[PDB]
């Protein structure tokens, strides 16, 4: 990812199709605004 601004980072060399990453995209191209979240410890998936 290349910093273009203090908050803005330009993701480059995007890789798609891993575990069907491309599968969602082929029907619908990514929208102008979306929430992009890095994988992290804070992310919580358990308890369901």
């Amino acid at each position: 990812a290349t910093l273009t601004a203090d908050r803005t980072w330009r993701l480059e060399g995007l890789l798609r199709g891993q575990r069907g990453t491309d599968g969602i995209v082929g029907p619908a191209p990514l929208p102008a605004g979306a929430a992009v979240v890095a994988i992290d410890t804070a992310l919580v998936a358990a308890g369901l």
């Binding site: 410890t41 919580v44 358990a46 308890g47």
Partner: protein
């Protein structure tokens, strides 16, 4: 002949937050705890930590983050030029 009874002096020295006390200004080789001076506040990386209940509630409560209060403790032993700093430790003779 006029005499001063020997004081406890350096033994059992503890760092003191208050700045009213004058600095030691040692003229020989003494070990001084000193008084904390200009601590740079504290670094509160994680104020509190939590315990996971696993399946019953949440297994994500536990935190591995570093403890708080990392700071620059600029303890000043004494005023004036000094040399021969060695053998220093909070709880013991020295740290590696």
């Amino acid at each position: 002949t006029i005499k001063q009874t020997g004081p406890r002096l350096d033994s059992l020295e503890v760092m003191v937050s208050q700045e009213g006390t004058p600095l030691a200004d040692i003229s020989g080789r003494v070990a001084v705890a000193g008084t904390v001076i200009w601590a740079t506040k504290l670094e509160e990386i994680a104020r509190t930590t939590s315990t996971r209940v696993g399946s019953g509630k949440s297994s994500q409560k536990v935190k591995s983050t570093n403890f708080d209060y990392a700071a620059s403790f600029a303890v000043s032993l004494g005023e004036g030029p000094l040399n021969g700093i060695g053998r220093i430790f909070l709880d013991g003779q020295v740290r590696d």
